[PDB]
Amino acid sequence: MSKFYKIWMIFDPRRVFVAQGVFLFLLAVMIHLILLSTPSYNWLEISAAKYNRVA
Amino acid sequence: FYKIWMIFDPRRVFVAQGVFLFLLAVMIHLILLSTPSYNWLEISAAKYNRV
Amino acid sequence: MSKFYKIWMIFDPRRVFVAQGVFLFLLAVMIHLILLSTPSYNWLEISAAKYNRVA
Amino acid sequence: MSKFYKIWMIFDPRRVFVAQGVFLFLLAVMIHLILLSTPSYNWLEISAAKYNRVA
Amino acid sequence: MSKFYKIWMIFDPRRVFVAQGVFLFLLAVMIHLILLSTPSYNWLEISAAKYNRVA
Amino acid sequence: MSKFYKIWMIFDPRRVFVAQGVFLFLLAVMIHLILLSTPSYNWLEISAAKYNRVA
Amino acid sequence: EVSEFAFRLMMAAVIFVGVGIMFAFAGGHWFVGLVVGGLVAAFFAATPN
Amino acid sequence: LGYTGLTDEQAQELHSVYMSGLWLFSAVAIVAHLAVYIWRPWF
Amino acid sequence: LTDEQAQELHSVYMSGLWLFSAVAIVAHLAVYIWRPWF
Amino acid sequence: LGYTGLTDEQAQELHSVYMSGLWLFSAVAIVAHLAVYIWRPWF
Amino acid sequence: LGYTGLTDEQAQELHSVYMSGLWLFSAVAIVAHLAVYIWRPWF
Amino acid sequence: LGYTGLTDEQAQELHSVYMSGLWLFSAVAIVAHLAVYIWRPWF
Amino acid sequence: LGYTGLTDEQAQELHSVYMSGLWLFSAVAIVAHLAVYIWRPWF
Amino acid sequence: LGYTGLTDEQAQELHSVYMSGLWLFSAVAIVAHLAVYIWRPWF
Amino acid sequence: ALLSFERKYRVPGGTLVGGNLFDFWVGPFYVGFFGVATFFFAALGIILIAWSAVLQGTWNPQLISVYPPALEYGLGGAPLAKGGLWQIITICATGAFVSWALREVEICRKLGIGYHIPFAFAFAILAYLTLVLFRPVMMGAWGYAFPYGIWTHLDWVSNTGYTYGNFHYNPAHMIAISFFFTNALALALHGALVLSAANPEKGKEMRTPDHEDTFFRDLVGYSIGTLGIHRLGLLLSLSAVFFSALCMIITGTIWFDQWVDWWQWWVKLPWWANIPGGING
Amino acid sequence: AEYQNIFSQVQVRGPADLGMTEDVNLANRSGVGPFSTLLGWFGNAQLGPIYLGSLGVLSLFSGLMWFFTIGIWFWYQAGWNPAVFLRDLFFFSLEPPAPEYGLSFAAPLKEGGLWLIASFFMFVAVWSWWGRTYLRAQALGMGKHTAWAFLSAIWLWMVLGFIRPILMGSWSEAVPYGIFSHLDWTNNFSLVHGNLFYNPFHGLSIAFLYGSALLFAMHGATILAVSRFGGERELEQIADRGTAAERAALFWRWTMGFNATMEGIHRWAIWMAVLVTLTGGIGILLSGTVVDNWYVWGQNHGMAPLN
Numbered sequence A, C, D, E, F: 001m002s003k004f005y006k007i008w009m010i011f012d013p014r015r016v017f018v019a020q021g022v023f024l025f026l027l028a029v030m031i032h033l034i035l036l037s038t039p040s041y042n043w044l045e046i047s048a049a050k051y052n053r054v055a
Numbered sequence B: 001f002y003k004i005w006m007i008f009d010p011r012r013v014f015v016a017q018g019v020f021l022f023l024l025a026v027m028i029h030l031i032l033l034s035t036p037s038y039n040w041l042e043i044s045a046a047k048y049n050r051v
Numbered sequence G: 001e002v003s004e005f006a007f008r009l010m011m012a013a014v015i016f017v018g019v020g021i022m023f024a025f026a027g028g029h030w031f032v033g034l035v036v037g038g039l040v041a042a043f044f045a046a047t048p049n
Numbered sequence H, J, K, L, M, N: 001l002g003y004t005g006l007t008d009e010q011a012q013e014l015h016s017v018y019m020s021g022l023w024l025f026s027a028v029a030i031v032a033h034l035a036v037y038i039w040r041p042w043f
Numbered sequence I: 001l002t003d004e005q006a007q008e009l010h011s012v013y014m015s016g017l018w019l020f021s022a023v024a025i026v027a028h029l030a031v032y033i034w035r036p037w038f
Numbered sequence O: 001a002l003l004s005f006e007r008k009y010r011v012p013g014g015t016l017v018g019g020n021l022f023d024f025w026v027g028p029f030y031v032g033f034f035g036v037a038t039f040f041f042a043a044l045g046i047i048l049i050a051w052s053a054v055l056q057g058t059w060n061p062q063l064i065s066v067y068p069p070a071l072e073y074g075l076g077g078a079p080l081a082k083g084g085l086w087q088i089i090t091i092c093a094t095g096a097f098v099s100w101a102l103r104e105v106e107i108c109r110k111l112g113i114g115y116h117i118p119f120a121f122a123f124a125i126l127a128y129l130t131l132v133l134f135r136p137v138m139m140g141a142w143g144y145a146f147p148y149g150i151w152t153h154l155d156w157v158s159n160t161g162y163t164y165g166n167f168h169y170n171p172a173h174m175i176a177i178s179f180f181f182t183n184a185l186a187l188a189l190h191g192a193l194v195l196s197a198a199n200p201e202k203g204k205e206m207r208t209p210d211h212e213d214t215f216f217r218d219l220v221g222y223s224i225g226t227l228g229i230h231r232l233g234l235l236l237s238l239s240a241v242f243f244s245a246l247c248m249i250i251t252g253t254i255w256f257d258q259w260v261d262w263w264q265w266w267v268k269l270p271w272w273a274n275i276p277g278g279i280n281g
Numbered sequence P: 001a002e003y004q005n006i007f008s009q010v011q012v013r014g015p016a017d018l019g020m021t022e023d024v025n026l027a028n029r030s031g032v033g034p035f036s037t038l039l040g041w042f043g044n045a046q047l048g049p050i051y052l053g054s055l056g057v058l059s060l061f062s063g064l065m066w067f068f069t070i071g072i073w074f075w076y077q078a079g080w081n082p083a084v085f086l087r088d089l090f091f092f093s094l095e096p097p098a099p100e101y102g103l104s105f106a107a108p109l110k111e112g113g114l115w116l117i118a119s120f121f122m123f124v125a126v127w128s129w130w131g132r133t134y135l136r137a138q139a140l141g142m143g144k145h146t147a148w149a150f151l152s153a154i155w156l157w158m159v160l161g162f163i164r165p166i167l168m169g170s171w172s173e174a175v176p177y178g179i180f181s182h183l184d185w186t187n188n189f190s191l192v193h194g195n196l197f198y199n200p201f202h203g204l205s206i207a208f209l210y211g212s213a214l215l216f217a218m219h220g221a222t223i224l225a226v227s228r229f230g231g232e233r234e235l236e237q238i239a240d241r242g243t244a245a246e247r248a249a250l251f252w253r254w255t256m257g258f259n260a261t262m263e264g265i266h267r268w269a270i271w272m273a274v275l276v277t278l279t280g281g282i283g284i285l286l287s288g289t290v291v292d293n294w295y296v297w298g299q300n301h302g303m304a305p306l307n
């Protein structure tokens, strides 16, 4: 269990960290886009309805 | 099992596993989201009368 | 927290700052376009209605 | 804050100045074009309506 | 302000002056073309209507 | 004003007179073509109408 | 034997289709999948060890 | 030993700092999830 | 890599798979408690 | 040692002012969100 | 010292002039925005 | 000093003549805008 | 001094000839514009 | 002295011959324009 | 009869099939097992075209036209006078083209050169088989192939194209055209540059490859180099043919409508589909 | 497989090459550009220098004004809207004067006066670039083969934009500047002239176009196949024939009964490509001036069956 750190002797941290950044940003963007494409969770439209902003 | 780390470079195996497992996991969630009986966001919206 | 500075032992700051500047601008432009694409948050159209500037 | 001047120890000021000048003009043009294409803010058409310059 | 003259120690004046000459001509051309494309500001059509030169 | 003569110490006069002659020719043709495209200023069509040559 | 760049091209192709499908769903248009999946797979293909 | 040059000591050091980054990142996420759940429960 | 390194790395790897699969088993139980598929 | 050739103290120097850039940038953003939220709340 | 070869003094000198141009450009833009807002408010 | 190889006096000499051109061009432009505005206001 | 290697005396002479051409060309153009405006005013 | 290796003496002579060609060509052009204007005025 | 340097190269071996049985020359032409095959298929196809002209009732070589079977035959064999001759000639053509490529391989082997030439020719064969074999069997009839006749195969091109409106709007066809035009440009420049170096101004020494680099750098700011231009000319040609085959194998198989309508996907992207003005608003 | 020499295995880089001097005015060369390691996999990595003398200034500034004139017309057609500009980009078109204006210059700016202005900038740009190709060869003491080859492309371009419109008597015959519109013009031209496939010079032009792809496929593949012998050092093979040139010649001799030389294959190359646009320009120039219905012409010249 304790030895998980040895992965950094087999991968270069530059490559891993860039891949992590790309991975996490894409995942976050994908999730926010799905919520925006879900009418029950599109916060801009929820607010528009709540405050009677259209007509 | 453990002899796979002789058959291959471990970097390739971990790259291939990590990519495939993520694409697998994502598509299973996309299948559930495209299934009306299991889309949690839609089920929640019906429960809480949001739509 | 304290040891996060060691990232500059890994990443050359020049390359990071270019990538970061590009990322932040595109992220900002993306969000402003989303709001302009939204009738409840397109400030130019909200303005036109508020002051009755069209017709 | 006031250590910000060290950015010039990392970035060649020629490449920064060229990049910035291109960025600032293209951004300014982009915004003026958005406003020319927006009927509530096209200043040429607004003045044409104000001064009855057509019909 | 007064130290701005050091820009000629960073940028070669020959390259700047060519770049600026092209920039200012294309900008000036664009604005004159925009106004010619604008019925309220096309000076040739304005004078034609004013002096009854056409139709 | 009086010191503008030092332009010739940084720009090769051969290049400047070429670039200037090119510029002036292209600008002059462009303006004459604009006037020819302009019915109120096409001097050949004006003189045709003036002298009843358009037939 | 498969060289690192040949492996990189294979994984980039897998990444292209997988990222393409998920962003096509998330973006609500297949072109969003093509743009995102393409640029990510190109980044992957360009970067062998 | 392994291909990418960091020593065992450096691997331990980097992993300890790395994990502290993950915990900070995931802590901020947990608060954001709690805020959204309190506002609009997804179950 | 040596045979020892292969045995070492595999013993590390399997402990990661045990953790991941345990979290997955809990997640399937959580979905089952919420809403079974059978 | 470092892939950049920075020493430890050089990395501390550069990070300490880098973070001040982020804190400045985010502080301006927080005011921007505050003004916009006061103008048109999204919750 | 630096990757560019600029000394600390050269960087301090350059930044002082650059920052004065930045604030000059910002001041003109602020007057430009203020005039446009009085002419035709967007908010 | 300098990437261009100009001395400080040369750069200061050159800038004085450049600025005189910029102000002259600006003055002509200001008069042109004033004439066009008095002829046909755009606000 | 400068990039072309012209002497200051050469540059003064060359400019005096050039400006004699510029004033000659512009004088003809001014006469042309006056004749066209008298013929057919564009304002 | 200049770029071409013509002497000032050669440059003065060549210009005198060239200008006599220019005046000859332009004189013929002037006569041609007068004839056409007499025949068919374009103003 | 040999070229003055040829004899040292005319050694045994390198054959794929037949050993020494066909390892000989007929004048300049190397034979081999596939030379026998190529000649037989070529002669048979040529004579069957001439016989098809007898059946057609014309001797004008511009009017000779061997049509494929009517669509009613599907992928079955037709009567020889009613498209079965096209079937046999297509088999002969395919036999000749493949035999010719395989003969080039054993010529490469005897000369010790790379296989780039027969590999490059296989792209032309696969484009041909796209139009006569793969696309017709996907579409389910031989009658979708083109007829063997000098002007009548252009009628097939015209009729096939206008089935989908203006065929310029096929996106793969646009790409293929761009490679074809770019290849002809590169060929002209490459021919001219080598000749301009080998044949300088009168009485000058031959220019070096350094002058070739210099001319193109001076002209366009870049030179691809002597190796790069031959790589380029090959890949431009092959890409043109690859995208040609692609543009046809999708046409009538996955795409059926007027190709101009395909481009509406871009115009009707949701973030700008409804913005007024322009051409499409 | 063995190594195919399509992409380099190892790149090397040295001091930048400033080029040969000859009679070139070295003051008009730029400095060297960056080295692209991406391009260095396929060709040379070095970018630049570039030569920028008097005709280059004329050509680039005229070409810029051509491109800018079309661009500002597209921004006007877009209603100045950046989203519409990118949406409709391939659909915008700067169109020649309508037929009723003939060859006159009286057409309004929106009605083809801007097309004339842009076409003037194009004319100057292309012809001054031709003189640039000629003079760059002259200053290096090279043969003028490149300029004369380029004149064949200019011949088709001149026919399309200038000569055929004048012979037909209106500018409306010329090509519109626009991505889809020039394709639509290409289709319309064939339909008006009764199927351009039956224009024999269009048929020849296609033969040479296909022949150019054939010949460059052959030549490129041949040189790569002998590159293991230094075959791509073609000028040295011309000056001193090695086994590379001999094996190349014999491959084609044994294949098809005849061959080229290392010089003379480039004579086939230049002429094959030149003939595309040489025959092309003749075929277009004949269309509408001499033959208005090429299919009917083909029926009367024994190449299409009679009705």
Ligand SMILES: CCCCCCCCCCCCCC(=O)OC[C@H](COP(=O)(O)OCC(O)COP(=O)(O)OC[C@@H](COC(=O)CCCCCCCCCCCCC)OC(=O)CCCCCCCCCCCCC)OC(=O)CCCCCCCCCCCCC
Pocket (backbone or CB within 6 Å): O195, O199, O200, O201, O202, P142, P143, P144, P145, P146, P148, P149, P151, P152, P155, P270, P271, P274, P278, P282
């Ligand atoms: C202007 C726009 C128009 C379209 C115009 C399109 C033109 C396209 C031309 C392309 C030429 C490429 C080949 C080439 O080598 O180019 C470089 C070459 C040499 O360069 P250099 O620097 O001057 O010299 C270097 C020196 O070391 C010698 O080099 P090299 O040995 O390689 O040069 C000899 C070449 C060059 O010869 C030519 O280029 C002749 C070009 C003829 C073009 C005719 C096409 C149109 C007519 C056909 C239309 C047909 C359909 C209508 O030698 C050869 O290539 C010889 C070719 C022999 C062909 C023999 C054909 C005989 C047929 C008659 C048989 C009768 C039997 C009874 O340049 C030249 O020699 C000058 C080329 C001049 C081109 C024509 C210019 C326009 C002519 C018409 C207007 C002016 C006259 C009225």
Ligand code: BCL
Pocket (backbone or CB within 6 Å): O045, O046, O049, O128, O131, O146, O150, O151, O153, O154, O157, P197, P202, P203, P204, P206, P207, P208, P210, P211, P214
């Ligand atoms: C590629 C996409 C289309 C097509 C579209 C067009 C169009 C469009 C045009 C032609 C043209 C030609 N086509 Mg076709 N053509 C196709 C398929 C073929 C095939 C084939 C086996 O696939 C062949 C041999 C031909 C042959 C030919 C020639 C008659 C002519 C000149 C080609 C050329 O120079 O090419 C490059 C090759 C060389 C320069 C080398 C020399 C080639 C010689 C000239 C070929 C002679 C073929 C001979 C008459 C056919 C009978 C063979 C004998 C029985 C042995 N076409 C398919 C269906 N083709 C043009 C023409 O003028 O048609 C009348 C024309 O306008």
Ligand code: BCL
Pocket (backbone or CB within 6 Å): O157, O181, O184, P125, P126, P153, P154, P156, P157, P160, P185, P186, P187, P188, P189, P190, P195, P196, P197, P201, P202, P205, P206, P207, P209, P276, P277, P279, P280, P281, P283, P284
């Ligand atoms: C429905 C459409 C019609 C048709 C209508 C036409 C028309 C109309 C024309 C052709 C022409 C051509 N046709 Mg046809 N054609 C059809 C069917 C075909 C088919 C086929 C398989 O069906 C094929 C292969 C062809 C093939 C061809 C080519 C052989 C020929 C163009 C050569 C060339 O390179 O032009 C492209 C090259 C040029 C135009 C030269 C350009 C040179 C200038 C100087 C470049 C300037 C560049 C500029 C300054 C910008 C530079 C910017 C850079 C960034 C630096 N046609 C059908 C029947 N075809 C042309 C021809 O010659 O006909 C005889 C022609 O005009």
Ligand SMILES: CC[C@H]1c2cc3[nH]c4c(c3C)C(=O)[C@H](C(=O)OC)c4c3nc(cc4[nH]c(cc(n2)[C@@H]1C)c(C(C)=O)c4C)[C@@H](C)[C@@H]3CCC(=O)OC/C=C(\C)CCC[C@H](C)CCC[C@H](C)CCCC(C)C
Pocket (backbone or CB within 6 Å): O038, O041, O042, O043, O044, O045, O046, O089, O092, O093, O096, O097, O100, O104, O117, O118, O120, O121, O123, O124, O147, O148, O149, O150, O151, O153, O237, O238, O241, P210, P213, P214, P217, P218, P221, P255, P256
């Ligand atoms: C892939 C890129 C380009 C390419 C490449 C290419 N072609 C090649 C090669 C290469 C690399 C060769 O090595 C090979 C060769 O040896 O060249 C001299 C060949 C070749 N390319 C040829 C022609 C050719 N290539 C063409 C195209 C192209 N070739 C591509 C654009 C075209 C057309 C129309 O675009 C033609 C006409 C030959 C000169 C030659 C192949 C010779 C060969 O196959 O010889 C054996 C067969 C015969 C001698 C005759 C067979 C006769 C048939 C049995 C009957 C006729 C049937 C035919 C279908 C009739 C069609 C009638 C037409 C009116 C439609």
Ligand SMILES: CC[C@H]1c2cc3[nH]c4c(c3C)C(=O)[C@H](C(=O)OC)c4c3nc(cc4[nH]c(cc(n2)[C@@H]1C)c(C(C)=O)c4C)[C@@H](C)[C@@H]3CCC(=O)OC/C=C(\C)CCC[C@H](C)CCC[C@H](C)CCCC(C)C
Pocket (backbone or CB within 6 Å): O181, O182, O184, O185, O188, O189, O192, O219, O220, P059, P060, P063, P064, P067, P068, P125, P126, P127, P129, P130, P133, P146, P147, P149, P150, P152, P153, P273, P274, P275, P276, P277
């Ligand atoms: C023999 C026939 C073939 C042929 C040959 C051929 N073409 C040639 C040559 C030859 C032998 C040359 O020598 C010449 C050349 O230089 O090649 C490298 C050329 C050439 N063939 C060209 C193109 C071309 N050739 C084509 C085709 C063909 N070329 C035929 C297949 C085609 C098509 C449609 O098939 C095209 C498009 C050019 C690359 C070049 C001629 C260049 C020329 O005349 O340019 C004039 C215009 C300019 C110099 C500039 C235009 C404006 C640009 C946007 C630049 C702007 C610069 C500015 C500083 C930036 C502005 C930015 C702002 C707007 C934001």
Ligand SMILES: COC(C)(C)C/C=C/C(C)=C/C=C/C(C)=C/C=C/C(C)=C/C=C/C=C(C)/C=C/C=C(\C)CC/C=C(\C)CCC=C(C)C
Pocket (backbone or CB within 6 Å): A020, A024, A027, A030, A031, A034, B022, B025, B026, B029, B030, C003, C004, C005, C006, C007, C008, C009, C010, H010, H013, H014, H017, H018, H019, H020, H021, H022, H025
């Ligand atoms: C719509 O629903 C969907 C479809 C999305 C459902 C599917 C969801 C899926 C499949 C989700 C998958 C989620 C996953 C796999 C998430 C993984 C997250 C991880 C692993 C996050 C890790 C974050 C780590 C961070 C932020 C670490 C940062 C570290 C640092 C800042 C320090 C780095 C170390 C340094 C500087 C030390 C250097 C050392 C030396 C010696 C110089």
Ligand SMILES: COC(C)(C)C/C=C/C(C)=C/C=C/C(C)=C/C=C/C(C)=C/C=C/C=C(C)/C=C/C=C(\C)CC/C=C(\C)CCC=C(C)C
Pocket (backbone or CB within 6 Å): C025, C028, C029, C030, C032, C033, D027, D030, D031, E003, E004, E005, E006, E007, E008, E009, E010, K010, K013, K014, K017, K018, K019, K020, K021, K022, K025, L002
């Ligand atoms: C889609 O979204 C829309 C477009 C609708 C809205 C969103 C828009 C967005 C996201 C906009 C973002 C804008 C940003 C990020 C703007 C940033 C602007 C900045 C940072 C501007 C900086 C300007 C600086 C200037 C003008 C500096 C000038 C300096 C000088 C002239 C002097 C230079 C120094 C010299 C000469 C000293 C040399 C010294 C020595 C010793 C040689």
Ligand SMILES: COC(C)(C)C/C=C/C(C)=C/C=C/C(C)=C/C=C/C(C)=C/C=C/C=C(C)/C=C/C=C(\C)CC/C=C(\C)CCC=C(C)C
Pocket (backbone or CB within 6 Å): A025, A028, A029, A030, A032, A033, C013, C024, C027, C030, C031, C034, D003, D004, D006, D007, D009, D010, J010, J013, J014, J015, J017, J018, J019, J020, J021, J022, J025, K002
């Ligand atoms: C998908 O749908 C939407 C977009 C609506 C929702 C999703 C949004 C998402 C996923 C957003 C994600 C946002 C993120 C991850 C933002 C992160 C932003 C960061 C990290 C910003 C950091 C900014 C840092 C700045 C401005 C730092 C500036 C530094 C300086 C000015 C100092 C320069 C000098 C130095 C470093 C000293 C050099 C030292 C020496 C010795 C030479």
Ligand SMILES: COC(C)(C)C/C=C/C(C)=C/C=C/C(C)=C/C=C/C(C)=C/C=C/C=C(C)/C=C/C=C(\C)CC/C=C(\C)CCC=C(C)C
Pocket (backbone or CB within 6 Å): D025, D028, D029, D032, D033, D036, E027, E030, E031, E034, F003, F004, F005, F006, F007, F009, F010, L013, L014, L017, L018, L020, L021, L022, L025, M002
């Ligand atoms: C509605 O339309 C649009 C969308 C286009 C609206 C938007 C418009 C925008 C974004 C406009 C932006 C405009 C800007 C950024 C303009 C900037 C103009 C500048 C920087 C002008 C500078 C002018 C300088 C001049 C004229 C200098 C002239 C110099 C001379 C005449 C003398 C020549 C130089 C000499 C002698 C120096 C050499 C001396 C020695 C001793 C070596």
Ligand SMILES: COC(C)(C)C/C=C/C(C)=C/C=C/C(C)=C/C=C/C(C)=C/C=C/C=C(C)/C=C/C=C(\C)CC/C=C(\C)CCC=C(C)C
Pocket (backbone or CB within 6 Å): E025, E028, E029, E030, E032, E033, F020, F027, F030, F031, F034, M010, M013, M014, M015, M017, M018, M019, M020, M021, M022, M025, N002
């Ligand atoms: C866009 O829509 C339109 C076009 C309608 C409106 C817009 C128009 C625009 C943007 C117009 C812009 C116009 C401008 C900026 C024009 C500038 C013109 C200039 C700078 C003209 C100068 C001309 C100078 C001349 C003709 C000088 C000639 C010199 C000589 C004849 C002397 C030659 C001999 C010399 C120098 C020898 C001396 C030698 C020794 C050795 C001492």
Ligand SMILES: COC(C)(C)C/C=C/C(C)=C/C=C/C(C)=C/C=C/C(C)=C/C=C\C=C(C)\C=C\C=C(/C)CC/C=C(\C)CCC=C(C)C
Pocket (backbone or CB within 6 Å): F033, P067, P068, P070, P071, P072, P074, P075, P116, P119, P120, P122, P123, P157, P158, P159, P160, P161, P162, P175, P176, P177, P178, P179, P182
């Ligand atoms: C981003 O926005 C900006 C504005 C900055 C830049 C954008 C630029 C854009 C979007 C440019 C678009 C360019 C396009 C789409 C160009 C398309 C060109 C095409 C496809 C041309 C095709 C054929 C053209 C031909 C055959 C033209 C031949 C012309 C001639 C032979 C010229 C003959 C000369 C004439 C007619 C002039 C006669 C008049 C006088 C006064 C002598």
Ligand SMILES: CCCCCCCCCCCCO[C@@H]1O[C@H](CO)[C@@H](O[C@H]2O[C@H](CO)[C@@H](O)[C@H](O)[C@H]2O)[C@H](O)[C@H]1O
Pocket (backbone or CB within 6 Å): O073, O075, O076, O077, O078, O087, O090, O091, O094, O132, O133
């Ligand atoms: C690369 C070469 C490409 C060209 C290759 C051509 C190969 C042709 C092989 C044909 C093989 C035999 O194909 C056979 O044809 C006959 C006759 O049409 C078809 O027969 C079909 O039509 C006949 C009448 O015309 C009906 O009576 C029959 O019931 C029907 O099936 C068979 O269904 C098919 O099996």
Ligand SMILES: [Fe+3]
Pocket (backbone or CB within 6 Å): O190, O194, O230, P219, P223, P234
């Ligand atoms: Fe070659």
